[PDB]
Every structure is written in C-alpha cells, then in structure tokens.
Amino acid sequence: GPSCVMDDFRDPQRWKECAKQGKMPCYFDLIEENVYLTEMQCECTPLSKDERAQGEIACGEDCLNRLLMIECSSRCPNGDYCSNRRFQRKQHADVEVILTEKKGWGLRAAKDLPSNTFVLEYCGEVLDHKEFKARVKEYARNKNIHYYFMALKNDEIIDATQKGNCSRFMNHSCEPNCETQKWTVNGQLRVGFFTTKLVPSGSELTFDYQFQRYGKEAQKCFCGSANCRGYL
Ligand SMILES: Nc1ncnc2c1ncn2[C@@H]1O[C@H](CSCC[C@H](N)C(=O)O)[C@@H](O)[C@H]1O
Ligand SMILES: [Zn+2]
Ligand SMILES: [Zn+2]
Ligand SMILES: [Zn+2]
Fold first, then answer.
1. Ligand 4 centroid from CA 223, angstroms
2. What effect on the protein does mutating residue 212 to A have, as reported in its record?
3. Looking at the chain, which terminus has fewer C-beta neighbours within 10 angstroms, N or C?
4. Pocket of ligand 1 (CB under 6 A)
5. 82 labelled as ligand-binding?
6. Is the C-alpha dihedral spanning 91, 94, 98, 102 positive or negative?
C-alpha cells in the first residue's frame, strides 16, 4: 500500500516521522559506498562529437573493461561519455520502496526496465568470517526477522542490517527478475543488482537469495511463483 521514492531517505528527521506512522521502513544508516569494518585503461576508440550527438554508446558491449566486469576510471579513452562507470556515477534505475503483503518492504520499478539494466549497488558494512559469525549470533539473540547478508568474496560478507542503501529492500523470489553481479572498481570488488529480463513499471524487483547462514529455523517463502522452493 504505502510507497516512497529514493529521495525520501535523504532527510533523516522527516524519515523517522514517516516511519513513526508506518509510511516508510524503519530507520537505518544510509551510506553511499561500502564501509570496511577492518581495512589500467581499455581499448575503446574514443567517440567523436557527431557519433556522441547522434547516439553512440561509449564503451559498449565490446569494451574490454566491461567484458571483465571492470569499470573504467577517470582516464578512460571516452572520458565523460563512458557508459561503463555506472557504480561510480550512481546511475541507478528508477525504483520505489513499497509495502508488500507479507515479506515486509520491497523494491518495485517506477519505470520500464530493459534487460541487463543496472538497478542498484548493494552497500553495507564489509565483515570478515569472524565478525560475520559474531553478528549472526547477535542477530539471533536480538530476534531479528530480516537478514541482510550478501556474499562478496572470501573473508568479505556485506551486512546491510545497520548501514546500507535501498538495495537492502530487494526481496527473494524463486522466479526472479534480477541477479547479482560483482564488479571491480579501482581494484576493489562491489556487487550490484541487474535485471535479467524486461521488468514492467510497477513490478516488484526480486532476485534469488543464495546465502548460507542457517541453523536459526528456516523462513517460508511467499514469492508466489509457479515453482517456489517453499523456503528461502
Ligand atoms: N520471498 C520472501 N518470502 C518471505 N520473506 C521474504 C521474502 N523475501 C524477503 N523476505 C524477508 O526479507 C528479508 C530480506 S531483507 C529484504 C527486505 C525486507 N523485506 C524488509 O522489509 O526489510 C528476509 O529476512 C525475509 O524476512
Ligand atoms: Zn572501453
Ligand atoms: Zn570507458
Ligand atoms: Zn518462492
């Protein structure tokens, strides 16, 4: 029923009042890039102004950085035209955070989303395996209901329980329309959501959770798909 746009989360005090009434999810620390709890160029021919003006993608699907799921930096041959700097430029798709029937809050497209469209980066606190297991028990002790863990690399798990952005609201489906992709940005790995098919406006954005924390009971899955696994 209730819904809200990405920008409603910039203002903290207005947010806590909307949350106090149930028109926005509960407060968390909004951040722009991953926070660690313990701390070359491509070959694309630069585009001329004509081909720029008439609609040519700079650093298209044949870009060497894009192929290795590396993002270009400042020094790219196309400079400002580079379409391969989506994480750094926060070129996120238009999405809204909405109340679902029983999964809690969720993400839905506010515009049509073509296939293999960048949706959002999944930000949060990065933990090693020791910190991760520490919080799994802190969160079972606090009877948390929603969990916000995302596998990044060996000895790196992303935890958006406390700090993150609106990507933390994407819910599970056994028949998803999104996936995670790991991208290198300045020598460092981040993960983001990408649509795996055309998502029509209004439709809820979902991906297929593949995380193992386990023990503390299992959660039933309300995705409502034809072939639902039954649980998360
Ligand atoms: N398909 C599904 N069925 C039941 N619960 C789901 C679900 N997908 C996501 N969830 C819930 O959402 C949590 C993941 S975090 C996703 C955002 C969450 N819906 C929220 O309001 O904050 C899970 O721990 C689970 O509680
Ligand atoms: Zn390139
Ligand atoms: Zn580039
Ligand atoms: Zn399901």
1. 4
2. Loss of methyltransferase activity
3. N
4. 25, 103-106, 145-148, 168-169, 171-172, 219, 221-223
5. yes
6. negative
| CB-CB contact of 103 with 171 (8 Å) | yes
Please state, in angstroms and rounded to a whole number, the distance separating the CA atoms of residues 81 and 84. 9
Q: Dump the DSSP string for 73-114.
A: -TT-TTGGGBSS-TTTTT----EEEEE-SSS-EEEEESS-B-
Contacts of 116 (CB under 8 A, 6+ apart): 194, 195, 196
Which domain covers residue 177, as residue numbers? 1-232
Annotated binding residue 92: no
Q: 102 C-alpha to center of ligand 3: Å? A: 42
Taking the CA of residue 25 as reference, the ligand 1 atom at the shortest distance is 21
- Using what technique was this structure determined? X-ray
Rounded Cα–Cα distance for residues 102 and 104 (Å): 6
Q: Using CA atoms, how far apart are residues 86 and 218, in angstroms rounded to an integer?
A: 35
Scan for tokens 């949350």, then name that residue.
19
Give the number of domains in the chain: 1
